[PDB]
RNA sequence: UAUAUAGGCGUCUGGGGGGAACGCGGGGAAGUGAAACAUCUCAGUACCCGUAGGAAGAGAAAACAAAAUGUGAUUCCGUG
RNA sequence: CUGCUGUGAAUCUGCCGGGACCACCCGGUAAGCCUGAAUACUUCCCAGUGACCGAUAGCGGAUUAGUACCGUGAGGGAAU
RNA sequence: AGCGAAAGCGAGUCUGAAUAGGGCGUAUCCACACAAGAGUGUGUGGUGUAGUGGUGUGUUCUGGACCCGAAGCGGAGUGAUCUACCCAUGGCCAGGGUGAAGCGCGGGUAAGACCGCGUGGAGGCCCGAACCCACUUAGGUUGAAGACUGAGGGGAUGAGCUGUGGGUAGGGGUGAAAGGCCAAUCAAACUCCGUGAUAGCUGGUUCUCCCCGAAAUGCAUUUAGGUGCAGCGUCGCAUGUUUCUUGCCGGAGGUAGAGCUACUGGAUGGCCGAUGGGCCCCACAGGGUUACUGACGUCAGCCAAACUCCGAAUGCCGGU
RNA sequence: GUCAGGUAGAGAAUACUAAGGCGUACGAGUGAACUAUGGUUAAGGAACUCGGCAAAAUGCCCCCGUAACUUCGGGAGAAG
RNA sequence: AAAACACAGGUCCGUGCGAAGUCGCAAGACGAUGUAUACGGACUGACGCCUGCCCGGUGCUGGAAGGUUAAGAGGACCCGUUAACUCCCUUUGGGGGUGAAGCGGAGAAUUUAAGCCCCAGUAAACGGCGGUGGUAACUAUAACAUCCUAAGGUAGCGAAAUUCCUUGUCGGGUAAGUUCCGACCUGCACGAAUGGCGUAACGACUUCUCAACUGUCUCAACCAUAGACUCGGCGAAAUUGCACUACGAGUAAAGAUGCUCGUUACGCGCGGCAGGACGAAAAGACCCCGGGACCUUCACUACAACUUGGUAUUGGUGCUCGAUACGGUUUGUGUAGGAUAGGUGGGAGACUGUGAAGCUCACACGCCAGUGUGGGUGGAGUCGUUGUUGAAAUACCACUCUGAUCGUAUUGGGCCUCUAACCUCGGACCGUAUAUCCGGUUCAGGGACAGUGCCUGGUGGGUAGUUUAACUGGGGCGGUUGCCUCCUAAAAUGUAACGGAGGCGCCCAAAGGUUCCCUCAACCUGGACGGCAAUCAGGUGUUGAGUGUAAGUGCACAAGGGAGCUUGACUGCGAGACGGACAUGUCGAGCAGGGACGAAAGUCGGGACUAGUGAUCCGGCACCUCUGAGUGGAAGGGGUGUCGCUCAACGGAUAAAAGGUACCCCGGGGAUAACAGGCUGAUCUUCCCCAAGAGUCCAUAUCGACGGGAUGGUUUGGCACCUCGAUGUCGGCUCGUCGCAUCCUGGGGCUGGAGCAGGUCCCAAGGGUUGGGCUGUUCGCCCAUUAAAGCGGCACGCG
């Protein structure tokens, strides 16, 4: 009487039970074809468990999907440019750049070692013990970088900007990830931890865009993340830059903000 | 409804109810005892029902018995 | 031995019983019926008797006694 | 006449292979022998064996069984004249407010909506007597009354109140549901009967004197405030000092005390001095120096219900 | 269950009355405490107490005028 | 009298109609003279916005391929009895073996329903709704990776009729705010029809506030009436061992009118007060014990009800399959070969023109190697012990297993039917003037079903009877219950407690018997691994090692270590004893049989010893010379050996059993708890001894650490001494009374006392010692005062 998600994770189909739920969610893994009727299934281990046959499953976290979705809309070159990750410590975003042939990447954490052992062996992988959260060091990360990916959680991503515009070059290219129910004053999270309010997302994206513009970093374009938090955390990836023909800083910022939520998700 | 029956009309002869105990045939507890209790007991008791008679019921072997050339319908009493 | 249900024979070199059953022996003759005496009792009547009571006893009732009275009622129930 | 489970045998019998031990039985005593002192046996004689039926007393068994006492259980009946609900057929509800729909008029509306005005008489409507309740409080509390009285209190045309007649009955009825009510009683009414229910529980049990005279412990217990058997009382019979005391004699103990270099543990201070500690010359050889920690040992003083190299007094067993 | 005089009054309420009916079955005394039932109370006014319990207070008619809120009926006899 | 019930509104489930449901044994009735917009049941409870997740558990509903399962059909196989033989062995018998039929007993395979397992749906069904590892804005305000599930609280609300902590925090309100209001979220232990959150109107509901009003109060005074009181009349009651019934300090069953010692008191009444008479009342209702009673449930065991199947009532024809008896085709690879050699008895002689041979196909199989039947053709034969071939015809009559077959006789399983039993609360007509009864007749429908008997399996708190241990410093909760060893245990034996420590419910065919032989542990010295340590050698070493297994007593004489043989880990017994309420239990020399070891002496009836166990009943099994319901057998019983009980509550109430009662009742108990009293005083409380210190120095102005000794009886306790045929339980009110351990007032000594004001100690009990807010409050917090707002005893004084 072994749980179906139990046998699945035992075989090696998915390294974690959260992924076992993702696979049963669309019914990618079942016996005799068909969607897995229910995640509560008593299946004998002598049966056959299938899979979506995802060829590009060389990923070790969920942060991969949201990134590959952003890079679909942006198509940003990585080789030949230094890169910065604002802290994932789980291989969600940096490992994708590894698959992108990144020249050299740097990642942060909360002062904790929990990365995949696979990434503890690549020479171009730098690990730091949360030197600082908001005012990132522009030189101790190895010098100048040419890309920064924003991945923040229970901290309103609006205080690391002075550091991330300094932790860059004069010709910089940045893709921040705006999480809606996390920009509102801490404690004022949306109803039940999930937000169904386009106007709240509008307020959050406007606040982050205006905070970026305060430094001069204008918003170029928008993107809706394809695979969000399971219970609900739909993200909206923007794009920071100070010198392009797409200097949407006066009126086009709002037009692009409507685009973000009108085509989101 | 034809055979007819169910019925209807008339004329007789009975039945009905009571009763203290005793009889016969049925139905049938619980308290109690078992130092608890259910089998078991109490007890086929108490009570109930149907029926009598001066008594009733039983009664003339499809019985006993045990190798005895033995008893011989039933009922009741004493023993065993 | 016996009730309800099912199945269900023979008429005497038959059938029943003799403490599972079988053989032999013995006893008897079911599925029809009547039957006195010896046995149980006393509402009532007669005549007696008591190392029985003697009026708080003996019947509840020696006297208005199943009365007066109590209870809606089944019923309880004096004292003299 | 007994032994045996029995067939059976019989002063024997059972077990057993056993004239080989034991069991039960051969009244009891006496003697004389023949065998062993491992508790005496065996045998020859003798003596010869006591029951039963009336009846008094004590105890006991079956019966209500020394007397009184439950809450309750069963059988058959009686009750809805109180109360619960229902059914038929009747009666009652002073007085005063409010002002629903409906209808009619006007305004307003493409037409409506709607409003203002009237008539109108709705309603588990309002205030409030009769009537029905019973919220507060005081009195009553061997009452006026086994549930009232006074002052206020809620409903008062309604799921209203009420009269007369009727129906539902006990593991049943009825319940706008409180285990409420069902005749001053209800977690199963009442009456009679079973019946003198049963109570390891409480209570009571009536004249005298004479002699003797306890126990409140052990064991078992659906047991722990009950009982059985033992102990301990009395009476009858048998035996006769067997009892008890004191002296002496023969014993076995491990308590008091003590001791511990006699063990097992604890435990005080010294003494020498390791091994393992550090350092020198300089190797991690080797050697010595040093608060070293300081095994073992040793000196002296100690401690113990489950320690004992020892070890009484008493008590106990026997003899005399 | 029926009948329902007068005067105030909306009234079958309440006060007093008519007709009619009663004075209903222990009394007579008496300025004790205390209890009960009524009454009044300077100044203060809930300080009482578990709590404004109980008392006190408002109370009728006619004009004027009425709030938040509302389910548009009400609240409302608001309050004044 | 309520917030509880009801309610209008909501949903869910059942019900197709003499419905379902209910009352009845039935008939019958209500439902309803209703018919799914109706009726019953369940929950919720106008209205408004909504009602999340979980179908794993348990129910409900549905389904069926399998597993399992009753009665009923089946009777293979076995056993009893004995007609017959067949034999001895002795002779007129009598035991051995076989044993047909018949009758009997136990009875297997096989077949068969529901249910259960199984798989689905269902939550406005009964029910459920998580964490961890390390984190940033200025700490936060749980929404980075991973474990687990049936899913991980949705919305809304939230110190709540819900919050112990708690008088949470902040604001309001008061002079003073434990209640209240508005919020906060750390929701011990809210949450979505046991609805969640709001809501106008309503309430003899609960709570907070303001105005007004007042004898509620400061703080009480006065008046009248009914009693009380006096006089006359009548005239009770509960109660009651007494009696010419003081107090104090004691003593006593521990709280005395009655006893002690002292003090006080002339005799008798009337009106008043309630301190005592553990006052009256009611065989304590709290608590324990015994017994009831009613209630609950997956306690036990039953029964109603519901339901399954078989069979009776109960029949007919058609098919489909199965079992029987009977008939005719039809079958057998083999090598020594004219052989696709069914097992045969007869076999010198059977088969043609009723057209066989050889040709045409099918039937039959085919390991397709080859052969039997028909007519269409066909022409007048083929065959044998032929010889090889175990077995010959494969030329013929009668018996025949293997098979592919049809039919008859018989009997089942099923299926579609028919009508004739039976059924209809469908119509009509009649008895019958009257009649929704009833019976009949007849038409129309079902129909061998249903219903009902009997047998049978399920479900079965719907009901019924009952059980649900004891010990216990009250009871409960915990723990324990039998056996063995030690200490307590006081030098015999025995000895209690919920006293102090541990073991047991086995193990070993050798770890049993015998015969013989040996001596360890530790220490020093010498040796490659090899270290203190492993095996070797030398020595010292009397017991410190080891003895299956706890502990104790033992054992070096060895009971300890080693080897040989071997089963005495025997059968018949047992003088005499230990221990003992009894029932149990324990030791035992010696005799005989038959053995083991030993030369023999001798030892051996398990183990160095003391745990390793369960009475009786009832039943099983093997053996025996017992019995055998007329007789012979048998069945059944009996003896002997043995088997089956965490009966572990271990002397074992049943084969079989849990809980609630605050709705409770009875019988008892001060044998036993709660209150008060009594004893004690661990704790509590109040003092003291010593003085390391602190105080700049200076123990002792003032505090005094570490330790030590006491008082009181106010606290929490310990005990269980009186009271359970009744000793009323907190706080406040009224009224006191006593102590002093003094709060104020009065008198002082020392000061680290200049004065003012204090600190500490000593003496002193005459008087005094406030009113409020918060709270049920005591306690306590606060407000305004005051000379001060003392602490205690008196049944935590006083109903
Ligand atoms: Mg008669
Ligand atoms: Mg009985
Ligand atoms: Mg009994
Ligand atoms: Mg009894
Ligand atoms: Mg006669
Ligand atoms: Mg006769
Ligand atoms: Mg006769
Ligand atoms: Mg008399
Ligand atoms: Mg006289
Ligand atoms: Mg009399
Ligand atoms: Mg009368
Ligand atoms: Mg005998
Ligand atoms: Mg024997
Ligand atoms: Mg003898
Ligand atoms: Mg005589
Ligand atoms: Mg005699
Ligand atoms: Mg009765
Ligand atoms: Mg009646
Ligand atoms: Mg009108
Ligand atoms: Mg109108
Ligand atoms: Mg009204
Ligand atoms: Mg009203
Ligand atoms: Mg009114
Ligand atoms: Mg009024
Ligand atoms: Mg009124
Ligand atoms: Mg009432
Ligand atoms: Mg009240
Ligand atoms: Mg009085
Ligand atoms: Mg009076
Ligand atoms: Mg009143
Ligand atoms: Mg009144
Ligand atoms: Mg009426
Ligand atoms: Mg009547
Ligand atoms: Mg009732
Ligand atoms: Mg009566
Ligand atoms: Mg009554
Ligand atoms: Mg009853
Ligand atoms: Mg009863
Ligand atoms: Mg009796
Ligand atoms: Mg009695
Ligand atoms: Mg004497
Ligand atoms: Mg005795
Ligand atoms: Mg005696
Ligand atoms: Mg002597
Ligand atoms: Mg001596
Ligand atoms: Mg000695
Ligand atoms: Mg000793
Ligand atoms: Mg000593
Ligand atoms: Mg020791
Ligand atoms: Mg000692
Ligand atoms: Mg008038
Ligand atoms: Mg009047
Ligand atoms: Mg007059
Ligand atoms: Mg006077
Ligand atoms: Mg007054
Ligand atoms: Mg005044
Ligand atoms: Mg005034
Ligand atoms: Mg006020
Ligand atoms: Mg106050
Ligand atoms: Mg106040
Ligand atoms: Mg006060
Ligand atoms: Mg009042
Ligand atoms: Mg008034
Ligand atoms: Mg107004
Ligand atoms: Mg208002
Ligand atoms: Mg007004
Ligand atoms: Mg009310
Ligand atoms: Mg009341
Ligand atoms: Mg209620
Ligand atoms: Mg409804
Ligand atoms: Mg439901
Ligand atoms: Mg029905
Ligand atoms: Mg429906
Ligand atoms: Mg409700
Ligand atoms: Mg609702
Ligand atoms: Mg729900
Ligand atoms: Mg669910
Ligand atoms: Mg579920
Ligand atoms: Mg389910
Ligand atoms: Mg399911
Ligand atoms: Mg089912
Ligand atoms: Mg059968
Ligand atoms: Mg809260
Ligand atoms: Mg509150
Ligand atoms: Mg709560
Ligand atoms: Mg609080
Ligand atoms: Mg506050
Ligand atoms: Mg609040
Ligand atoms: Mg519910
Ligand atoms: Mg709840
Ligand atoms: Mg719910
Ligand atoms: Mg509600
Ligand atoms: Mg609320
Ligand atoms: Mg409200
Ligand atoms: Mg009301
Ligand atoms: Mg009320
Ligand atoms: Mg005064
Ligand atoms: Mg007077
Ligand atoms: Mg007088
Ligand atoms: Mg005194
Ligand atoms: Mg005293
Ligand atoms: Mg005295
Ligand atoms: Mg005297
Ligand atoms: Mg007096
Ligand atoms: Mg008095
Ligand atoms: Mg008085
Ligand atoms: Mg009393
Ligand atoms: Mg009592
Ligand atoms: Mg009890
Ligand atoms: Mg049938
Ligand atoms: Mg049937
Ligand atoms: Mg049941
Ligand atoms: Mg029951
Ligand atoms: Mg009984
Ligand atoms: Mg008991
Ligand atoms: Mg007990
Ligand atoms: Mg205790
Ligand atoms: Mg105690
Ligand atoms: Mg001793
Ligand atoms: Mg001694
Ligand atoms: Mg003792
Ligand atoms: Mg143990
Ligand atoms: Mg040995
Ligand atoms: Mg041996
Ligand atoms: Mg050696
Ligand atoms: Mg040995
Ligand atoms: Mg043995
Ligand atoms: Mg003996
Ligand atoms: Mg021998
Ligand atoms: Mg021997
Ligand atoms: Mg027995
Ligand atoms: Mg016989
Ligand atoms: Mg015989
Ligand atoms: Mg036998
Ligand atoms: Mg026991
Ligand atoms: Mg026992
Ligand atoms: Mg038993
Ligand atoms: Mg209740
Ligand atoms: Mg009682
Ligand atoms: Mg006592
Ligand atoms: Mg007291
Ligand atoms: Mg006490
Ligand atoms: Mg006392
Ligand atoms: Mg100083
Ligand atoms: Mg005692
Ligand atoms: Mg006493
Ligand atoms: Mg008491
Ligand atoms: Mg008394
Ligand atoms: Mg009293
Ligand atoms: Mg008394
Ligand atoms: Mg006082
Ligand atoms: Mg003093
Ligand atoms: Mg003082
Ligand atoms: Mg002074
Ligand atoms: Mg001074
Ligand atoms: Mg003076
Ligand atoms: Mg308060
Ligand atoms: Mg005082
Ligand atoms: Mg007190
Ligand atoms: Mg006091
Ligand atoms: Mg009191
Ligand atoms: Mg009182």
Give the DSSP letter string of chain A: --BHHHHHHHHTS-SSHHHHHHHHHHT-S-SSSS--S-SS-B--TTS-------TT---SSSHHHHHHHHHHHH----TTS-EEE---SSSSSHHHHHHTT-S-EEE--SS-----GGGGS-TTEEE-----SSS--SSTTSS--SEEE---SSS-TTSSHHHHHHSS-SS-EEE-EE-GGGTS-TT---GGG----HHHHHHHHHHHHHHHHHHT-EE----B-SS--SSS---EE--EESSSS--B-SSHHHHHHHHHHHT--
Strand F bases near protein CB (under 7 Å) are 54-56, 133-138, 140-151, 154-156
Interatomic separation, CA of residue A149 and C1' of nucleotide F516, rounded (Å): 96
Strand F contact at CB of residue A94, distance < 7 A: no
Strand F contact at CB of residue A193, distance < 7 A: yes
Strand F contact at CB of residue A204, distance < 7 A: no
Burial of A103 (0-12, 13-18, 19+ CB in 10 A): middle
**Which residues in A142-170 are b (16+ Cβ under 10 Å) and which e?**
eeebbbbbbbbeeebbbebbebbbebbee
**Which residues in A186-225 are b (16+ Cβ under 10 Å) and which e?**
eeeebeeebbeeeebbbebbeebbebbbeeebbbbbbbbb
Interatomic separation, CA of residue A80 and C1' of nucleotide E65, rounded (Å): 90
Tokens, residue A247:
């200097």
Tokens, residue A152:
């923040």
Q: Please name every residue paired with A169 in a beta bridge, in sequence order, or none if there are none.
A: none
Strand F contact at CB of residue A127, distance < 7 A: no
Q: How many CA atoms lie within 13 A of A253 on its CB side?
A: 21
| Cis upstream peptide for A265 (omega within 30°) | yes
In which residue are the tokens 């954490």 written? A109
**Nominal resolution (angstroms):** 3.0
Q: How many Å apart are CA A97 and CA A104, to the nearest integer?
A: 9
Tokens, residue A224:
């809706």
Q: How many Å apart are CA A77 and CA A38, to the nearest integer?
A: 42
Which residues, 6 or more positions from A158, have their beta carbon under 8 angstroms from its beta carbon? A183, A207, A208, A211
Tokens, residue A189:
């999270």
Q: How many Å apart are CA A73 and CA A258, to the nearest integer?
A: 17
Q: Which sign, positive or negative, has the C-alpha torsion A26, A31, A37, A43?
A: negative
């Amino acid at each position: 009487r072994a749980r179906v998600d139990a046998e699945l994770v035992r075989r090696g189909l998915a390294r974690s039970r959260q992924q076992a739920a993702e696979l049963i969610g669309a019914g990618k893994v079942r016996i005799d074809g068909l969607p897995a009727v229910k995640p509560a299934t008593a299946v004998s281990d002598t049966t056959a468990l299938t899979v979506v046959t995802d060829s590009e499953r060389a990923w070790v976290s969920r942060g991969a999907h949201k990134l590959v979705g952003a890079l679909e809309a942006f198509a940003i070159a990585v080789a030949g440019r230094r890169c910065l990750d604002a802290g994932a410590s789980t291989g969600g975003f940096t490992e994708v750049l590894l698959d992108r042939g990144a020249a050299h990447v740097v990642a942060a954490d909360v002062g904790y070692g929990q990365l995949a052992w696979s990434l503890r062996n690549d020479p171009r992988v730098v690990v730091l013990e949360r030197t600082n959260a908001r005012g990132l060091t522009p030189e101790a990360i190895g010098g100048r970088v040419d890309l920064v990916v924003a991945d923040l959680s229970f901290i309103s991503l609006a205080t690391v900007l002075p550091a991330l515009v300094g932790c860059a070059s004069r010709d910089a290219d940045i893709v921040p990830l705006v999480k809606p129910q996390f920009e509102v004053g801490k404690g004022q999270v949306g109803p039940g931890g999930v937000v169904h309010d386009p106007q709240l997302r509008a307020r959050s994206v406007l606040a982050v865009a205006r905070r970026a513009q305060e430094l001069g970093w204008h918003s170029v374009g928008v993107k809706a993340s394809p695979l969000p938090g399971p219970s609900g955390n739909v993200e909206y990836f923007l794009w920071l830059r100070t010198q392009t023909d797409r200097a949407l800083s006066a009126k086009g910022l709002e037009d692009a903000v409507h685009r973000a939520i009108s085509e989101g998700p």
